[PDB]
Symmetry: D2
Subunit: 221 residues, 4 copies
């Protein structure tokens, strides 16, 4: 392969959210095989961002996933050529985000070029009023469709005062190379904002992913 | 009230693509280890022109294994019971709306089911009976209006390896005040164990185990 | 056979959010003009603890005015009749599924309906009864697998400003093969003309005229 | 009355659709109060387009709409300043298009810059296989939410062979100064391409758009 116990990360994101443009860069590091990582991010244009930073966070790389050896790792196999992805996030109040990202490797550094579009967030809703506290942790199902890997998740944001604001995630990941394809399976995720200034110009972001099958054993044969 | 072993009885009235049917079933389970089995029989509208897989999840979370650190909304619902209302949206516009009332009498739960399936395309894998099974899934649960809401991104393995996808939303409604749990998951696995040629006779199995995320929070301490 | 003046007979079994109900109605209409009137009484379930507005459209495109040049899928389907099957997906994820069989017994039509509504948030505008009226609407109808699909963007005007949105998708079913209409529209307006604050008793009027577009083509 | 019977139009488009970038520019003329315009288009970069061009055409201005007297033009009254809109197009085949447009006025000539993002269109798809003939005439319904003008349409593309590729359109319209909003109403739409060259790099486009309330008069008025 070419991936190691420790890898560095470089992110570049541009986007637009409800007519507001912004760019954000980051530099981070993680452990592909243990499926954890941390990223330091800076808002370069558009500060102070007037929407919850949480809608961005999952946009900011499934090579940092712990993949048992019994499950082909689509992502690690995709390198050095790499892989890209595309995502739709539809919120329950009809806010919506579409997102594209290219994932290359130079040396030990993965670079992430991300474009991020968000739209239709009601001016008095949790996103533009920043009432989000965090994403509940989540489980993503991964299936093949046209040889692409496609993943879906029912996500929820924990709001100030408990209870949740939901959004459905659809992601399509595409290798730039012939790779052994996995069976149907899952990824347990927890994403976290560790630390941030009050306005979010700097944010330290963290992510744990573990792949599996189901743990309920089949009655079949 | 809820004993290590219990019986189950089901009555379902349905209509799928303007075709009515009725199904009766009887079985048993271990509410606390969240396993159970069911014998089903078509008492009307035999033989069914469409895949039995759409019916199976309609035919009680009482049978879920809950850790003692998650409140069991369901068990708590009893003696009195709880009802549930569910949407199933298929990727090709096929829709079922489903409702079930769950009362207890003796050692045997009784489930009264209304199941309306509409709008399946004639040449889709539903009417052409081209599905094989549900992949096991992970449902996520939350409180909203004092009821409990489950969402699941479902998928049918087709004949030829592909998947036919379906989203699930169930609102569960205890008929008394109970102790509401924190946001959690239930992992599932449903399987048809045996069937006669017509699926006029069906032997169903379900395993449901509740949990939090396996992944540690890293933020603060 | 479908004569200028007809009688309508209406029976509806329903469950919304668990509360079961039966509603019966009878009236008359001018099918070839698009109007009809209906006197409804609630036989079971009263008082209904939810917006009556959800029910009113499930209570016949036979009473649409159709022109010469647009096939009338509905009057054509008689004397044998048709059924239909409808999905209503409301913006707060309240959803309804309806079926109604439309039959003829001489001068009176007998529409027999199954209504099912569920997941209405207990505090939403349907269970709290905060809806004044359906707006007037326009349904696009097209062919897909030999049968006739309608879609309509619906909206209920709400107690003091605000609109609550609903998508309607109906699929219609001929009890004969009929002539298949080209893509086209049917403008709608329905209204409760009177009621008892509980809606035990209601008067109900529908209008509607099938048309093509009122804009001309520049295609050559 | 800053706006004339006759106005010119500038139109500038960049976008993606399944991973294929493009930049489209057009010049045209039209009549605001009659509801009619025309438009000539060069595919500036990205030619030949690898997708159907109809998916673009509704993004290449509701000024060019005949608004009767008793419904205030939300769109013409928006100026001098200008306006924007956000739009989703959710195709039945799950291809999604998310669109933001920015509409100005200098001299006699309105400027349109469009951000076209296109996603998830199948490879045996109508939009990728270029199988579309035109949009069927339409009726949009338009309402107030959050003091923004929202519109919903049930659109349908006719396809070689007859038959139809459906798409649900919601567009939310955003004036940059505080106009008086109309009540509930409808626009009838007809959009037509008047001619194209084989790969469609060159195109003239014509839309006609009339506002109205429901013709039907009120029984209870």
């Amino acid at each position: 392969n070419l991936i190691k116990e420790d890898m560095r990360v470089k992110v570049h994101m541009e986007g637009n959210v409800n007519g507001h443009a912004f760019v954000i860069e980051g530099e981070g590091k993680g452990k592909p095989y243990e499926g954890t990582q941390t990223l330091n991010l800076t808002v370069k244009e558009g500060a102070p961002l007037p929407f919850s930073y949480d809608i961005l966070t999952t946009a900011l790389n499934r090579v940092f996933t712990k993949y048992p050896e019994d499950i082909p790792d689509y992502f690690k196999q995709s390198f050095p050529e790499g892989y890209s992805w595309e995502r739709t996030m539809t919120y329950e109040d009809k806010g919506i985000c579409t997102i594209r990202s290219d994932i290359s490797l130079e040396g030990d550094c993965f670079f992430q070029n991300v474009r991020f579009n968000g739209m239709n967030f009601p001016p008095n809703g949790p996103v533009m009023q920043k009432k989000t506290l965090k994403w509940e942790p989540s489980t993503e199902k991964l299936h093949v469709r046209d040889g692409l890997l496609v993943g879906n998740i029912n996500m929820a944001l924990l709001l100030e005062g408990g209870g949740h604001y939901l959004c459905d995630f659809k992601t399509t990941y595409k290798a730039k190379k012939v790779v052994q394809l996995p069976d149907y399976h899952f990824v347990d995720h927890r994403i976290e904002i560790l630390s941030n200034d009050s306005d979010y110009n700097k944010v330290k972001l963290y992510e744990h992913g573990v792949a599996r099958y189901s743990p309920l054993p089949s009655q079949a044969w």
